[PDB]
Design a protein around this ligand. Structure first.
Ligand SMILES: *[C@@H]1O[C@H](CO)[C@@H](O[C@@H]2O[C@H](CO)[C@@H](O[C@@H]3O[C@H](CO)[C@@H](O)[C@H](O)[C@@H]3O)[C@H](O)[C@H]2NC(C)=O)[C@H](O)[C@H]1NC(C)=O
Ligand SMILES: *[C@@H]1O[C@H](CO)[C@@H](O[C@@H]2O[C@H](CO)[C@@H](O[C@@H]3O[C@H](CO)[C@@H](O)[C@H](O)[C@@H]3O)[C@H](O)[C@H]2NC(C)=O)[C@H](O)[C@H]1NC(C)=O
Ligand SMILES: *[C@@H]1O[C@H](CO)[C@@H](O[C@@H]2O[C@H](CO)[C@@H](O[C@@H]3O[C@H](CO)[C@@H](O)[C@H](O)[C@@H]3O)[C@H](O)[C@H]2NC(C)=O)[C@H](O)[C@H]1NC(C)=O
Ligand SMILES: *[C@@H]1O[C@H](CO)[C@@H](O[C@@H]2O[C@H](CO)[C@@H](O[C@@H]3O[C@H](CO)[C@@H](O)[C@H](O)[C@@H]3O)[C@H](O)[C@H]2NC(C)=O)[C@H](O)[C@H]1NC(C)=O
Ligand SMILES: *[C@@H]1O[C@H](CO)[C@@H](O[C@@H]2O[C@H](CO)[C@@H](O[C@@H]3O[C@H](CO)[C@@H](O)[C@H](O)[C@@H]3O)[C@H](O)[C@H]2NC(C)=O)[C@H](O)[C@H]1NC(C)=O
Ligand SMILES: *[C@@H]1O[C@H](CO)[C@@H](O[C@@H]2O[C@H](CO)[C@@H](O)[C@H](O)[C@H]2NC(C)=O)[C@H](O)[C@H]1NC(C)=O
Ligand code: NAG
Ligand code: NAG
Ligand code: NAG
Ligand code: NAG
Ligand code: NAG
Ligand code: NAG
Ligand code: NAG
Ligand code: NAG
Ligand code: NAG
Ligand code: NAG
Lengths: 752, 743
C-alpha cells in the first residue's frame, strides 16, 4: 500500500497518481519503481535535487499548479540527475524564469501559465532532444511585462524541436531563427499584427500554423480580448506562406479578416483544415477566389462571420465552393440569414465527400428540406438554434475557436443519417415537417416547446428513425399508437417532458411502448409521472434500459389500492433500471419483489430511503450493481451474503451509516467495489473485520467519515495491511474528526 | 404582554393573529375583548362547548387547515352571540357541524368531506348571505355524487353568494332562493342546463358554469372531458329570466357554438369568459356578438384548433357591435400573420384599451395597424415569433389571465407595448417603424444581442420605462439609449455581455446622458470590470440596483480604482448591494457611497466586518439591511453615529452579544442570530416611546436565571412590540429545548 500516492499499473510503466491531495512537499515514500509521477494541484513550494532522489526510473513528472491558490522555488539542477526524464510539466507555478540546469534527456517541456518574460539560451539551448516546448500564457495582460524577451537565436540550436507554442504572450512579432525541424507553430493571441515573407524563414517542414486571435473579433471569449485599432485586420503579406508546402492546418480564426488573398494558398496544395471563424468574410464567402486554391481541404470553418445589423434573405455561397473536391465538413454557424433555398446550396451538391453540414445559430426561418436529398454522402445535418416552424403547407490548452465536441451524440449518429432540429420553433409537428427528407436514422427535436399529441402518423415520412431525441418538450403520448410508425426505433429520449393535456384516468398511459419490437433504451426521466392508467403490466421483450428518475413513484407506490405494485414486471429483458430522484421513503416489499427478474443494475440514489430490506436481494440473482447513494439509511444487514452471490458494486455514500455490522467486509466474495464514503462512521469495527473466503474487494471507499483516531483505529489500520489487494483510494482524505490533536490528519498518520 | 397570539387593532376594533403557530388546542390567554380571531394552520384537534369562553364580542373565527380531522361538538359555537363570519376550510369535516349559530352571515366549509348538504346543518342559518361549500365531493372514492337535500337552500332568503364549485353535482339543485346575486358552479359535472334550472333567479349578477365538459389544457386539478367531442348542453331559453347578469363564466365547456338566444335578455352583460373552448368558427361568424352592446371584457383565449396554424386570424365583422369593449383576450388562437385588414372590426371600438395576443406564435405583424385605434393603452404581444425587421389556491380565478398583463409601474406612463419572449435577436432598423407613441416597452428574453449605439429607438423616442431584461445587450458605447431623452426606468437585470473587450467592458458612461433617469437596475450583470475615466454623474438617479455583480472584485482592486464608483450619483436615495460576495467593504469605499442615501441594502453578502462609526456620513439613512451576512460585532454607541436610522435589520448573521447601552431606532431585527442571553447591562429605562419593534425569534436562548433579567425588562416596556413570541425559543437547558421563553 503506497502512500500518499495511488500507485497503478499501465502496461509496463507504473504511475503514481498523487494530485490534489494537499501535499506541502514532494513525498519521500514514492515507490522506487514508479515511472510517472503526477504531483499536480498540491501546495508544494520547494523543489531540490533531494526531492526526486533515488527515483531514477522517472520518465515523466507533472508539477502543475503548485502551490495551488509566491511561486514554486526550483533550485538549479534539481532535475539534472534524473537520466531517464523525458517529460516535465511545470504549468501554473508562478515561475519567474526558466529553471536552470534542466536535464538534456527532456523531449517534452511545458512551462505555460508562469511569469516567464525572458526566454534565454541559458534556459533551453542545451535541451537538444526537445521535441515539444510549451511557453503559452506567460507574458500575458501583465503590467510588469510589456513584451516577451526572446533572446536572439534561442530556439535555433533546438534541432529536434517539432512543436513550439508561444500563444497568449505579448510577442508583437514572430521570433526569427526558428529551427527548420519545426512542424507545429502556435502563435495565437500574441499581438502580431503583421506577417511578412521572412517570418517563416526556412520552416519547410511546417504542417500547422496557428495565428488566430491577432486583431480579434471579440465574441464571447473566455480570456481578455482587445481588437486592433480601428477594429482593423491582421496584415499578412501575399507571399508570407509561399515556402509552406507541407502545411495541413491553418488557423486564422479571429483575425478580423475582410479579404482572403488567394495567393496565400498557392504553394500549399495539401492544406486539409482551414479555420476562418470570427472574421468578416461574408463578402469572401460570396466571391471567394481563394476557394479555387484548396483542392484537398477536408474541413472548412467559416462560423460567426455575420455582418452586424444584417439579416439577409438568403445565404450567398460562391459557385467556387464546387472546387472544394475533398471537403468533408463545412461549418457555417452564425452567418445569419432567413431562408435556405435549393439553389443557394448548388455549389455543395457536387462535393462527393461532404458528410457534415453545420448551420447552427443562423436564425433560419425556412428551409427547402428536399435540397438535402441531393448529396452523395450527407450524414450529419446540424440545424440546432434556428427558427424552423411547423410545416403546414477554462482549459488553457483548448481549441477555443472551433466547435470541437461531436455536433450530434455519437450514440445517435452511429445509426446513420442524422438530422438535428433542436432549439427551433417547432411547437407542434406539422403534417409536412419531414416531407422529402433523406432516410433519417437519427433525429433531434429537443427543446422546441413541442406540444404534439402523438398519434402514429407524425413521423411516417421518415419511418426508419432508430434514435429519437424528444427531450424538453410538452408532448402527449397517452395514445397507444404514439410513435408506432417508427417500427425500428431503438432509443427514445423523453427526458423533461411536461405534459400539457393531463386527463384524469388517462394520463400517463404508457401502452405505446409494447408496440416496438426493437426498443432497447427508454428515458422517461423528469416527466413528473404520478399517475398510470395501463390496464395490465406493460410488456416488452426487447427493452434493456429504463430511466425513470425524477418522477413520483413515492405516490404510485403509496397507492391505497396497490395498483402500481407490478408496473415494471413485464419488462422481461430489462437489465438496467434507474429509480433515482423519486422521493422514495420506503419501497413496499411487494413492489421491490416485482422489479424485473433480469436486473443487473438498479439505481435508487437520491431518494429519501430510511429503510432498505436487504433480504429482498434473493429475488435478483443477476444483480451486479446496487446504487443506494444519497439516501437516509441507518442500518445494514449483518448477512449480505445470505441475500446475494452476484453483487459486485454496492454504493452507499451520503447516507447516515454509523456502524458496520459484524460480518460485512465479507462474506460477500463477489463484491469488488464498496463505497461507504460520506457517512457517519467513527470507527471501523473488529468483526465487520473478518476475512473469508477471499475478500476479493479491490475497492473500498471511506473518505468523508468523522473518524476517531485513538488506538481504536488500530484494528482497521492492521487490516489495511493484511489485505493489500483491497485498494483504499484517496487515503489522504480518510480524515480524523477527533480528537482535537489528530483532527485534519489522515487515519494513516497515527502510530502503533 | 399578548400571548400566544399577536393582537393588532383596527378601529377601536381588535384582531387576534394566531395562525401558523403549532397550537394543540384553542388558547385561553386570548385578549378577552377581540372581535376577529385567526387560528389557521395549527394542530387544533377539538373545538368544544368550552373552547371559546370569555369572548362575547367575537364576530369572526378562522379555523382553516386544522390540523395538518377537526372534531366539533353539537352547538359548539352557540355561546358566541356576535358571530357573523365562520371559516372551516380544509378541516377534514365529515358533516356540516350541526347546531351552528343563527347569527351567521358568512360560512365557509370548502375542502372538507361533506357529501350530504342537510336542512339540519344549514336550513335554520337564515341570516346567511355568503355560503362556500366548494371542494367537498371532489374526485373522492367514497363519494360518487353530492346529495343536496330538496329545498335545503329555499329558506336561506338573504343568501347572496352560493358556491358549490368542485363537487360532483351532475344537476343544478332545484329550489334556489331568489335573492341570489352570485352562483358558482364551476367543475360540478353538470353537462346540461335546462329552461328551469335558473328561471326566477331575477337578482343574478354572476353565474359560473366553467369546467363542465372541460377542454383539458394544463389544469391544476383533475380534468375529465365529457365523452365524445362533447360540449356542455345549454337550453336555448336557459337564461331567459336572467336579466341582471353582469358576469358569465363559460370557460372550458367545450363549446363549438354560441347560441345568440342565450343573450337575448341579458342587456347588462359586462364580462364574458369563453376561454378553452372550440370557438374559432364562432369567432369568424359570431351572431351572438350582436347581443352584447354593454360587454366590457371578452376572453376568447385558447380556442385553437389542434394541428392548425392558419395564416390569419379570422375576426367577424360582428365584433364592431361590441361598442362597450375595453379588453379583448385572444391568447392561443395560433396564427402566422397579423395584417391591418384582419383587425378592422376592432378599430371601430372607441373604448378598447387592452389587446391581449400572447402565445399565438405570430411570425409577423403590420405594426401600423395599432395607430388606427382610439384608446389603445396595452398591446400585449408576449410569446410570439416576431423577428428583427430589416429593409395551489382553491379560491382562484383558474381560467382567466388575472394579474396585470404589464407591470402597472410601466403601464402608468402611457401606451405600453410588450414584445417579451419573441425572436427579436437584435433590433432591426425597421423594428419600431409606424408604431404609436410608446411610453412603456418590454423586450425581455429575446436573446437580443444588439450593440446599442444611440439610434435603435429613434422611432419611439418617448419611451419612459424600458424592460431589456434577460438579454445579451452591449451598452459599452457612451451613446447607448441616449435617443431616449425621457427615459425614467431602465431594467437591465440578467444581461449577459457577449462581446467583452478588456479595457472597455463594462463602460457605463451612457448613464450620465439622461437628465430624468430615476431607476436603474443592473442586477446579475456579472460586472467585475469598469472603465469609466471619472466618477459617473447622475443628478436624477434615485434608485440603483447593483445586486448579483462583483463588487468584491471591484473593491479589492490593488490600485483602488473603484473606490468612488457611486459618489457622483448625488440624488441616490436607495442602493442595493446584495449578492455581491462582499466579505468587507473598504472604509474609503463606504465613505464614498452617496451622502443622500435613505435606504441601503447589503444583505446576503458574506460580511465578517462592519464599521459602524461611518454611519456619521449618512445623516439621511433610515434603513440599513445587513441580513444574511457573517457579522459578530455590534458597537456599544450607535447613538453617536446616527440620529436618522429607523430600521436596522441584522437577522441571519452570527451575533452572540449585545453591548451595554443597546435613540432613532424604531425597528431592530436580531432574529435568527446566536444570542444565548441579553444581560443586565444591555438594559436601560425609561419608555418615552424609543423603539417600537424588536425581533428575536430563532435565537438559541439560554433559559436559566440570566434570562430573568430580560423577562422583567419585557414587562417593563409594553410599547416595545415583539412578534412571533412562540418562536422565541430556549436551547438551554435539556428540558427547556424547545419551550418558548415566556417560561
Ligand atoms: C487553431 O487551430 C488549430 C488546428 O486545429 C488548433 O490546434 C489544435 O489544438 C488542440 C488543443 O491545443 C490540440 O488538441 C490536442 O490534441 C492532442 C493529441 O495530439 C490531445 O492529447 C490533447 O488533449 C488535445 O485534444 C490539437 O492537436 C491541435 N491540432 C493539431 C492538428 O495539432 C488550435 O487549438 C486552434 N487555436 C486556438 C487558439 O483555438
Ligand atoms: C439534441 O439537442 C440538444 C440541444 O442542442 C443536445 O443537448 C446538448 O447536448 C450536450 C450534451 O452532450 C450539452 O453539451 C455539454 O455542455 C456542457 C457545458 O454546458 C459541458 O459540460 C459538456 O461537456 C457538453 O459540452 C449541451 O449543453 C446540451 N444542450 C442543452 C441546451 O442542454 C442533445 O445532446 C442533442 N441530442 C442528441 C441525441 O444529439
Ligand atoms: C436518458 O437516458 C439515456 C440512457 O441511460 C442517456 O443516454 C446514455 O447516457 C450515458 C451518458 O450518461 C451514455 O453512457 C456514456 O457513453 C459514453 C460514450 O460511449 C461513455 O464514454 C461514458 O463513460 C458513458 O458510458 C450512454 O451511452 C447513453 N445511452 C444511449 C443509448 O445514448 C441519456 O443521456 C438520458 N438523457 C438525458 C437528457 O438525460
Ligand atoms: C416583461 O416581460 C417579462 C416576461 O413575460 C415579464 O416577466 C414576468 O413577470 C411576472 C412578474 O410580474 C412573472 O409572473 C410571476 O410568476 C410567479 C411564479 O410563477 C408568480 O408567483 C407571480 O404571482 C407572478 O405571476 C413572470 O414569471 C415573469 N416571466 C418570466 C419568464 O420571468 C416582466 O414582468 C415584463 N415587464 C414589464 C415591465 O411588464
Ligand atoms: C429591477 O429593479 C427595479 C427597482 O427596484 C424593480 O422594480 C421595483 O420592484 C419592486 C417590487 O419588488 C416594486 O415595489 C413594489 O411596488 C408596489 C406598488 O404597487 C408595492 O405594492 C409593493 O409592495 C412593492 O413595494 C417597485 O415598484 C419597482 N420599481 C419600479 C420603478 O417599477 C424591478 O423589479 C427589478 N427587475 C427585476 C427583474 O428584478
Ligand atoms: C369564472 O369567472 C368569474 C368572473 O366572472 C370568477 O369569479 C371571480 O372569482 C374570483 C376568485 O374567486 C373572485 O375574487 C371574484 O370576485 C369573482 N368575480 C366576481 C365578479 O365575483 C370565477 O372565478 C371564474 N371561475 C373560475 C373557476 O375561474
Ligand atoms: C473521398 O473519400 C474517399 C474515402 O476516404 C477517398 O478515397 C477519396 O479520395 C475522396 N474523394 C476526394 C478527396 O475527392
Ligand atoms: C443536384 O446536384 C447536382 C450536382 O451534382 C446539380 O447538377 C443539380 O442541379 C442538383 N439538382 C437539384 C434539383 O438541385
Ligand atoms: C389515437 O390516435 C388515433 C389517430 O389520431 C385516433 O384514431 C384514436 O382515436 C386515438 N385514440 C385516443 C384514445 O385518443
Ligand atoms: C403496433 O402499431 C401498429 C400501428 O398502430 C399496428 O399495426 C400493430 O399491430 C401494433 N402491434 C402491436 C404488437 O401492438
Ligand atoms: C435483450 O437484451 C440484450 C442486451 O442485454 C440485447 O442484446 C437483446 O437484443 C435484447 N433482446 C431482444 C429480444 O431485443
Ligand atoms: C423483508 O422481506 C422479508 C423476506 O420476504 C420479509 O420476510 C420481512 O418481513 C421483510 N422485513 C420488513 C421489515 O419488511
Ligand atoms: C366608454 O368609456 C367612457 C368612460 O369610461 C364612457 O363615457 C362611455 O360611455 C363608454 N362607452 C360605452 C360604454 O359605449
Ligand atoms: C381605420 O379604422 C376605421 C374605423 O375607425 C376603418 O374604417 C378604416 O378602414 C381603418 N383604416 C385603416 C388604414 O386600417
Ligand atoms: C458608438 O456608436 C456610434 C454610432 O453608431 C459610432 O459612431 C461609434 O463608432 C461608437 N463608438 C465606440 C467607441 O464604439
Ligand atoms: C472606521 O472608519 C474610520 C474612518 O475611516 C477610521 O478612523 C476607523 O479607524 C475605522 N475603524 C476600523 C475598525 O476600521
Amino acid at each position: 500500500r503506497s502512500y500518499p500516492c495511488d500507485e497503478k499499473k499501465q502496461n509496463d510503466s507504473v504511475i503514481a497518481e498523487c494530485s490534489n491531495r494537499r501535499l506541502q512537499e514532494v513525498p519521500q515514500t514514492v515507490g522506487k519503481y514508479v515511472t510517472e509521477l503526477d504531483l499536480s494541484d498540491n501546495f508544494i513550494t520547494h523543489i531540490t535535487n533531494e526531492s526526486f532522489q533515488g527515483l531514477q526510473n522517472l520518465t515523466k513528472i507533472n508539477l502543475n499548479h503548485n502551490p495551488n491558490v509566491n511561486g514554486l522555488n526550483i533550485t538549479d539542477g534539481a532535475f539534472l540527475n534524473l537520466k531517464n526524464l523525458r517529460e516535465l510539466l511545470l504549468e501554473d507555478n508562478q515561475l519567474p524564469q526558466i529553471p536552470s540546469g534542466l536535464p538534456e534527456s527532456l523531449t517534452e517541456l511545458s512551462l505555460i501559465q508562469n511569469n516567464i518574460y525572458n526566454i534565454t539560451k541559458e534556459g533551453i539551448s542545451r535541451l537538444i532532444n526537445l521535441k515539444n516546448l510549451y511557453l503559452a500564457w506567460n507574458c500575458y495582460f501583465n503590467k510588469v511585462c510589456e513584451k516577451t524577451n526572446i533572446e536572439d537565436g534561442v530556439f535555433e540550436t533546438l534541432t529536434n524541436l517539432e512543436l513550439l507554442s508561444l500563444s497568449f504572450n505579448s510577442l508583437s512579432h514572430v521570433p526569427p531563427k526558428l529551427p527548420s525541424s519545426l512542424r507545429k507553430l502556435f502563435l495565437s493571441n500574441t499581438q502580431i499584427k503583421y506577417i511578412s515573407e521572412e517570418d517563416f524563414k526556412g520552416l519547410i517542414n511546417l504542417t500547422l500554423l496557428d495565428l488566430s486571435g491577432n486583431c480579434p473579433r471579440c465574441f464571447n471569449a473566455p480570456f481578455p480580448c482587445v481588437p486592433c485599432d480601428g477594429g482593423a485586420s491582421i496584415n499578412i503579406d501575399r507571399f508570407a506562406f509561399q515556402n509552406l508546402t507541407q502545411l495541413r492546418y491553418l488557423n486564422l480564426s479571429s483575425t478580423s479578416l475582410r479579404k482572403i488573398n488567394a495567393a496565400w494558398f498557392k504553394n500549399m496544395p495539401h492544406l486539409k483544415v482551414l479555420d476562418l471563424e470570427f472574421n468578416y468574410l461574408v463578402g469572401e464567402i460570396a466571391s471567394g477566389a481563394f476557394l479555387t486554391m484548396l483542392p484537398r481541404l477536408e474541413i472548412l470553418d467559416l462560423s460567426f462571420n455575420y455582418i452586424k445589423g444584417s439579416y439577409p434573405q438568403h445565404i450567398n455561397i460562391s459557385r467556387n465552393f464546387s472546387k472544394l473536391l475533398s471537403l468533408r465538413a463545412l461549418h457555417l454557424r452564425g452567418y445569419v440569414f432567413q431562408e435556405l433555398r435549393e439553389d443557394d446550396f448548388q455549389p455543395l451538391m457536387q462535393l462527393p465527400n461532404l458528410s457534415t453540414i453545420n448551420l447552427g445559430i443562423n436564425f433560419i426561418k425556412q428551409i427547402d428540406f428536399k435540397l438535402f436529398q441531393n448529396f452523395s454522402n450527407l450524414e450529419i445535418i446540424y440545424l440546432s438554434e434556428n427558427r424552423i416552424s411547423p410545416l403546414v403547407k477554462f482549459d488553457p490548452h483548448s481549441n477555443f475557436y472551433h466547435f470541437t465536441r461531436p455536433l450530434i451524440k455519437p450514440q445517435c449518429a452511429a445509426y446513420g443519417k442524422a438530422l438535428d432540429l433542436s432549439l427551433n420553433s417547432i411547437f407542434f409537428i406539422g403534417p409536412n415537417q419531414f416531407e422529402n427528407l433523406p432516410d433519417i436514422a437519427c433525429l433531434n427535436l429537443s427543446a422546441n416547446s413541442n406540444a404534439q399529441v402523438l398519434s402514429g402518423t407524425e413521423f411516417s415520412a421518415i419511418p426508419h428513425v432508430k434514435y429519437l431525441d424528444l427531450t424538453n418538450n410538452r408532448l402527449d403520448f397517452d395514445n397507444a399508437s404514439a410513435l408506432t410508425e417508427l417500427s425500428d426505433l431503438e432509443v427514445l429520449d423523453l427526458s423533461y417532458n411536461s405534459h400539457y393535456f393531463r386527463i384524469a384516468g388517462v394520463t400517463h398511459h404508457l401502452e405505446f411502448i409494447q408496440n416496438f419490437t426493437n426498443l432497447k433504451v427508454l428515458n422517461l426521466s423528469h416527466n413528473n409521472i404520478y399517475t398510470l392508467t395501463d390496464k395490465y403490466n406493460l410488456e416488452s421483450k426487447s427493452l434493456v434500459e429504463l430511466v425513470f428518475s425524477g418522477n413520483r413513484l413515492d405516490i404510485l407506490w403509496n397507492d391505497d389500492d396497490n395498483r402500481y405494485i407490478s408496473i415494471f414486471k413485464g419488462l422481461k429483458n430489462l437489465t438496467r433500471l434507474d429509480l433515482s430522484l423519486n422521493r422514495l421513503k420506503h419501497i413496499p416489499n411487494e413492489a421491490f419483489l416485482n422489479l424485473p427478474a433480469s436486473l443487473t443494475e438498479l439505481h435508487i440514489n437520491d431518494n429519501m430511503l430510511k429503510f432498505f430490506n436487504w433480504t429482498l436481494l434473493q429475488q435478483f440473482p443477476r444483480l451486479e450493481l446496487l446504487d443506494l447513494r444519497g439516501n437516509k439509511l441507518l442500518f445494514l444487514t449483518d448477512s449480505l451474503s445470505d441475500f446475494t452471490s452476484s453483487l459486485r458494486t454496492l454504493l452507499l455514500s451520503h447516507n447516515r451509516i454509523s456502524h458496520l455490522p459484524s460480518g460485512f467486509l465479507s462474506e460477500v466474495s463477489s463484491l469488488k467495489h464498496l463505497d461507504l464514503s460520506s457517512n457517519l462512521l467513527k470507527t471501523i469495527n473488529k468483526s465487520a473485520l473478518e476475512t473469508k473466503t477471499t475478500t476479493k474487494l479491490s475497492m473500498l471507499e471511506l473518505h468523508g467519515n468523522p473518524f476517531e483516531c485513538t488506538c481504536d483505529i488500530g484494528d482497521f489500520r492492521r487490516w489495511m495491511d493484511e489485505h493489500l489487494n483491497v485498494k483504499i483510494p484517496r487515503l489522504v482524505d480518510v480524515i480524523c474528526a477527533s480528537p482535537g490533536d489528530q483532527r485534519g490528519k489522515s487515519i494513516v498518520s497515527l502510530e502503533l
